[PDB]
Amino acid sequence: HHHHHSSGLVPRGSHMTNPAYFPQLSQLDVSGEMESTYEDIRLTLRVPWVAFGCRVLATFPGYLPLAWRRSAEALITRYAEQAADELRERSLLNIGPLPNLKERLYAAGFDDGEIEKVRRVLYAFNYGNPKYLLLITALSESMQMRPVGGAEVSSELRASIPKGHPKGMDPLLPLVDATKASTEVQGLLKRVADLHYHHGPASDFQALANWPKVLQIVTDEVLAPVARTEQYDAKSRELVTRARELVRGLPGSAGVQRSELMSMLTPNELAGLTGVLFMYQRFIADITISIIHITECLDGAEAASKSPFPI
Amino acid sequence: TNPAYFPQLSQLDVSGEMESTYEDIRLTLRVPWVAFGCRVLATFPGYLPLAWRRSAEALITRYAEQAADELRERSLLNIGPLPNLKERLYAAGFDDGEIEKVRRVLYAFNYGNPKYLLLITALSESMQMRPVGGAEVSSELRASIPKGHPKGMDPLLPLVDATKASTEVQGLLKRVADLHYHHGPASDFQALANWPKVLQIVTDEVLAPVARTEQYDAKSRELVTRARELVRGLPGSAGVQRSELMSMLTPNELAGLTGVLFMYQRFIADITISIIHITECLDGAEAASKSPFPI
């Protein structure tokens, strides 16, 4: 079975030649227990998307439904929320002074109502991005036979937060499919991915690609002078490391150890899975920073770094 | 299933075209081991033989040799005054002959490690559909180097196999892997595992206050980033673009392979620094940074 059903107007397989496409199971394409998992990830994390990293993990037989089932309880703790809160706050780059991005979007105009639509998207991602960095870290760390959780934590941080989505947030954010997209947009997504030296475009960039000119401006004018700079790389290393410590201190258990997946996955798959998790620690960290940076250029440091959706 | 072991295809088990690939890698790079990175890359159907074929001629050029030379020199950490590892090994019951055996292994690795970084970086970048090679290169630097192993160098190093090892060896290899936050131990450490005491001294006394420090991490990003730039300047072709692999590998193997290559870029930069650092404590900055097998 193939999931990509392009028409007779292109050859079968064409989408894989698309540099802005990366192999993944999409939110639309997913069915069965995987579809249930996807929905559960979104309600449990209070986010309107399934992370690119999860969608790639979804392509490994059996893994993600099990991996999520073992991490879900831990990721609804006040601890996990506070942990994502800290990582979100640490994401700020000490750069100054910043492009006034709002006046810039006016100049591209863009009125207040349209900039609010960009902002809504930026905020949903600011909220979930650090949360996903913890999940992927709990998963990567246990995949590599290092301890995840089991820590001694007060009742208050063990308490859980409610499942569902907060008032200011639509349940499911529309992402541009790079395979149904124009040359211009494929170009835009591939350029921002290459800018970060990434394997593909983050869901973040799929979502802003709804306004191709917004994505262009934030890529070439906002992110180009900052991405992959010393200070940027240093900040990413700090998030990767901090998230690593945060998952050690988790109450309960998260992730699934590589020894326990011997019955489930082939050696090759376990090697690819290990490499995929490694990569997504850094990818999410990078993206966590880039989008908070854009947000800061728009609204400032407090709006950027505080939880957009308190919870 | 024990944590010191990671999925790979060993130099011993390899057979068919894959065995021929391994031997040619050893002959072409002039190194006594096929990298852990490569041994794991060999678990994906058809990839490594193909990937090597299309990179071997880029990787035997004088440009590539001089590129590896640079990356090796860039590897020194400026950390301050060092443990005298020669006098520490004497203190631990080693004589001159045994330190010479350890030296020979350190120098072999110092030599090969940055070459493997260039190879895996080329594989990584081309897998991520970003340009590799095709630069303007002087006739002098497109000139290949002689194939085969130099003198002062074993044609194949003994590497301890973690799956068969004592609790002691299994523990030491995990500890050093965890120190660097690695998914499994380097061959470097499998080779030093032949002298368990050496592996422990180097892990606990030398690398323990150095690995994963801010300085180390910055040096590791330096090499990853430099290797990248050097690979762009390669003569002729290298690697295999993701586009050329779709009729061979599944979507999941492509994603797994992307992620595996991205990880080994950082792994080999790390180990290059760590082992070169160990070597500096033995013999000084000059013996550690410079090519042990100049050609």
Side-chain angles (χ1 to χ4, degrees), chain A residues 118-166 168-194:
Chain A
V118 168
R119 176 179 291 113
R120 290 184 85 245
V121 167
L122 293 169
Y123 281 26
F125 280 101
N126 293 347
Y127 180 76
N129 266 351
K131 304 191 87 174
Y132 277 117
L133 182 54
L134 287 160
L135 172 57
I136 294 317
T137 311
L139 300 194
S140 176
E141 217 47 37
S142 55
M143 181 55 51
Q144 296 177 27
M145 319 279 295
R146 282 186 295 266
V148 175
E152 253 278 294
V153 176
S154 71
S155 326
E156 292 86 46
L157 290 166
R158 263 195 278 109
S160 32
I161 69 185
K163 283 208 211 178
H165 296 119
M169 191 199 262
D170 290 313
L172 203 42
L173 224 143
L175 313 181
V176 172
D177 187 343
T179 74
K180 286 158 209 158
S182 54
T183 281
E184 191 201 26
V185 179
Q186 286 171 49
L188 291 168
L189 293 167
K190 169 65 166 164
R191 155 98 170 145
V192 67
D194 289 344

Side-chain angles (χ1 to χ4, degrees), chain A residues 1-166 168-310:
Chain A
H1 185 252
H2 306 264
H3 272 107
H4 277 90
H5 303 110
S6 46
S7 63
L9 310 174
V10 303
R12 194 145 82 191
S14 281
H15 69 279
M16 206 64 73
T17 62
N18 193 339
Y21 178 70
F22 190 78
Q24 60 192 286
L25 185 42
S26 79
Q27 318 202 68
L28 196 78
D29 287 346
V30 83
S31 56
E33 59 156 7
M34 194 61 82
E35 187 182 0
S36 274
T37 296
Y38 274 35
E39 169 79 358
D40 199 36
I41 283 162
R42 297 189 291 261
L43 291 158
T44 302
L45 303 184
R46 322 160 73 240
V47 292
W49 88 108
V50 168
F52 185 25
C54 289
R55 309 197 302 260
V56 174
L57 294 175
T59 76
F60 290 87
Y63 178 61
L64 174 74
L66 171 79
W68 173 247
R69 176 183 318 130
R70 316 272 281 245
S71 314
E73 287 160 79
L75 303 185
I76 30 122
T77 69
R78 171 68 57 208
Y79 181 108
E81 190 76 25
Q82 215 57 35
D85 286 349
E86 165 170 10
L87 296 163
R88 192 174 311 106
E89 225 206 335
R90 289 182 177 268
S91 306
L92 292 172
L93 292 163
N94 206 38
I95 284 165
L98 295 179
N100 179 304
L101 188 49
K102 181 183 324 224
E103 290 303 330
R104 175 64 188 99
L105 292 170
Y106 286 157
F110 324 108
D111 58 86
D112 279 2
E114 293 167 302
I115 297 165
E116 184 54 56
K117 299 318 189 166
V118 168
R119 176 179 291 113
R120 290 184 85 245
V121 167
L122 293 169
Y123 281 26
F125 280 101
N126 293 347
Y127 180 76
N129 266 351
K131 304 191 87 174
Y132 277 117
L133 182 54
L134 287 160
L135 172 57
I136 294 317
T137 311
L139 300 194
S140 176
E141 217 47 37
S142 55
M143 181 55 51
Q144 296 177 27
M145 319 279 295
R146 282 186 295 266
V148 175
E152 253 278 294
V153 176
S154 71
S155 326
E156 292 86 46
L157 290 166
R158 263 195 278 109
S160 32
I161 69 185
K163 283 208 211 178
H165 296 119
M169 191 199 262
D170 290 313
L172 203 42
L173 224 143
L175 313 181
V176 172
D177 187 343
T179 74
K180 286 158 209 158
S182 54
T183 281
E184 191 201 26
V185 179
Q186 286 171 49
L188 291 168
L189 293 167
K190 169 65 166 164
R191 155 98 170 145
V192 67
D194 289 344
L195 201 88
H196 290 78
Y197 295 98
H198 280 166
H199 55 290
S203 303
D204 299 62
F205 300 136
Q206 293 179 255
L208 291 155
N210 279 307
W211 307 280
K213 188 196 204 163
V214 165
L215 178 54
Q216 178 152 51
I217 291 176
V218 308
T219 295
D220 294 344
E221 317 182 20
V222 184
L223 294 185
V226 294
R228 300 275 78 98
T229 59
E230 249 181 20
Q231 189 155 22
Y232 182 98
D233 283 352
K235 180 59 74 182
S236 184
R237 261 144 32 215
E238 161 186 343
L239 255 47
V240 175
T241 305
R242 186 53 183 148
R244 182 164 269 139
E245 301 165 345
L246 285 162
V247 325
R248 289 264 188 278
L250 267 169
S253 301
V256 46
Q257 307 267 303
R258 162 172 58 77
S259 51
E260 199 184 324
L261 302 154
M262 249 63 162
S263 277
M264 255 212 34
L265 294 151
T266 71
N268 187 233
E269 281 162 347
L270 293 164
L273 180 55
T274 300
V276 165
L277 287 154
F278 188 90
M279 186 168 69
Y280 274 105
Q281 300 183 260
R282 283 79 182 166
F283 179 101
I284 313 281
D286 295 343
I287 301 299
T288 294
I289 297 158
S290 289
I291 301 297
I292 283 176
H293 195 60
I294 288 160
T295 312
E296 189 190 342
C297 286
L298 192 68
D299 293 342
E302 188 184 83
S305 75
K306 276 210 161 176
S307 176
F309 304 101

Side-chain angles (χ1 to χ4, degrees), chain B residues 129-183:
Chain B
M129 300 163 75
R130 220 143 38 230
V132 179
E136 303 286 27
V137 193
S138 83
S139 61
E140 267 84 310
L141 292 172
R142 303 182 70 101
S144 83
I145 64 172
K147 214 158 154 178
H149 288 72
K151 289 190 186 182
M153 196 207 263
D154 297 343
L156 189 75
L157 298 158
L159 297 184
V160 166
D161 178 350
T163 54
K164 270 173 300 174
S166 46
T167 274
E168 164 189 38
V169 168
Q170 280 186 339
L172 287 167
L173 291 167
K174 174 75 181 152
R175 274 184 168 86
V176 73
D178 286 353
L179 205 69
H180 295 93
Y181 298 92
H182 280 170
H183 59 291

Side-chain angles (χ1 to χ4, degrees), chain B residues 16-285:
Chain B
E17 186 189 23
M18 200 65 75
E19 179 175 25
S20 197
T21 291
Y22 280 36
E23 170 67 22
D24 195 50
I25 289 171
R26 287 190 305 255
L27 285 178
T28 298
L29 302 189
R30 306 159 81 235
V31 295
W33 86 107
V34 175
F36 183 29
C38 296
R39 268 180 263 143
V40 172
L41 289 181
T43 58
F44 293 91
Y47 177 72
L48 184 56
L50 165 55
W52 176 250
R53 273 210 291 289
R54 272 183 221 159
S55 318
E57 301 183 313
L59 296 198
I60 204 172
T61 63
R62 201 142 180 82
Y63 174 101
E65 177 68 28
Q66 291 196 356
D69 274 6
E70 196 194 302
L71 285 168
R72 200 153 39 227
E73 273 165 32
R74 296 175 70 120
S75 295
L76 300 167
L77 304 160
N78 302 113
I79 201 218
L82 304 168
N84 183 339
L85 191 54
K86 203 174 290 182
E87 187 49 65
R88 174 80 183 84
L89 290 168
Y90 288 141
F94 295 89
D95 58 27
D96 288 354
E98 294 171 302
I99 287 149
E100 188 55 23
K101 282 175 206 287
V102 180
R103 181 146 35 228
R104 285 183 69 114
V105 163
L106 296 169
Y107 282 23
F109 285 108
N110 296 336
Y111 184 63
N113 277 341
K115 286 187 139 183
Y116 276 129
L117 177 61
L118 284 151
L119 167 61
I120 301 286
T121 303
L123 299 190
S124 200
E125 286 300 291
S126 58
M127 175 76 57
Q128 301 192 23
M129 300 163 75
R130 220 143 38 230
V132 179
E136 303 286 27
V137 193
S138 83
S139 61
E140 267 84 310
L141 292 172
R142 303 182 70 101
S144 83
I145 64 172
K147 214 158 154 178
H149 288 72
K151 289 190 186 182
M153 196 207 263
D154 297 343
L156 189 75
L157 298 158
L159 297 184
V160 166
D161 178 350
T163 54
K164 270 173 300 174
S166 46
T167 274
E168 164 189 38
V169 168
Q170 280 186 339
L172 287 167
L173 291 167
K174 174 75 181 152
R175 274 184 168 86
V176 73
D178 286 353
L179 205 69
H180 295 93
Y181 298 92
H182 280 170
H183 59 291
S187 312
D188 305 58
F189 299 125
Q190 288 175 268
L192 297 165
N194 279 288
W195 307 265
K197 183 93 213 156
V198 172
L199 186 51
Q200 192 185 47
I201 291 170
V202 305
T203 307
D204 301 358
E205 295 170 47
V206 177
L207 293 177
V210 162
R212 292 295 152 233
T213 64
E214 256 178 4
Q215 229 219 302
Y216 191 83
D217 290 357
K219 184 54 68 184
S220 184
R221 89 132 265 198
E222 195 194 319
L223 293 177
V224 166
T225 301
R226 189 58 183 141
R228 213 213 283 123
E229 294 171 356
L230 291 164
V231 142
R232 298 261 190 274
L234 245 35
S237 284
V240 208
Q241 299 269 326
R242 188 173 75 79
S243 324
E244 308 169 30
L245 295 176
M246 326 163 295
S247 52
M248 198 192 83
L249 307 155
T250 62
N252 177 239
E253 281 167 350
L254 291 175
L257 183 64
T258 292
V260 159
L261 286 162
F262 175 102
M263 171 171 80
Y264 273 98
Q265 271 183 274
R266 285 89 184 147
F267 183 104
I268 307 167
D270 291 343
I271 292 296
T272 299
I273 305 159
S274 284
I275 298 310
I276 262 165
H277 183 69
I278 280 156
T279 302
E280 186 184 9
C281 297
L282 205 84
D283 290 336

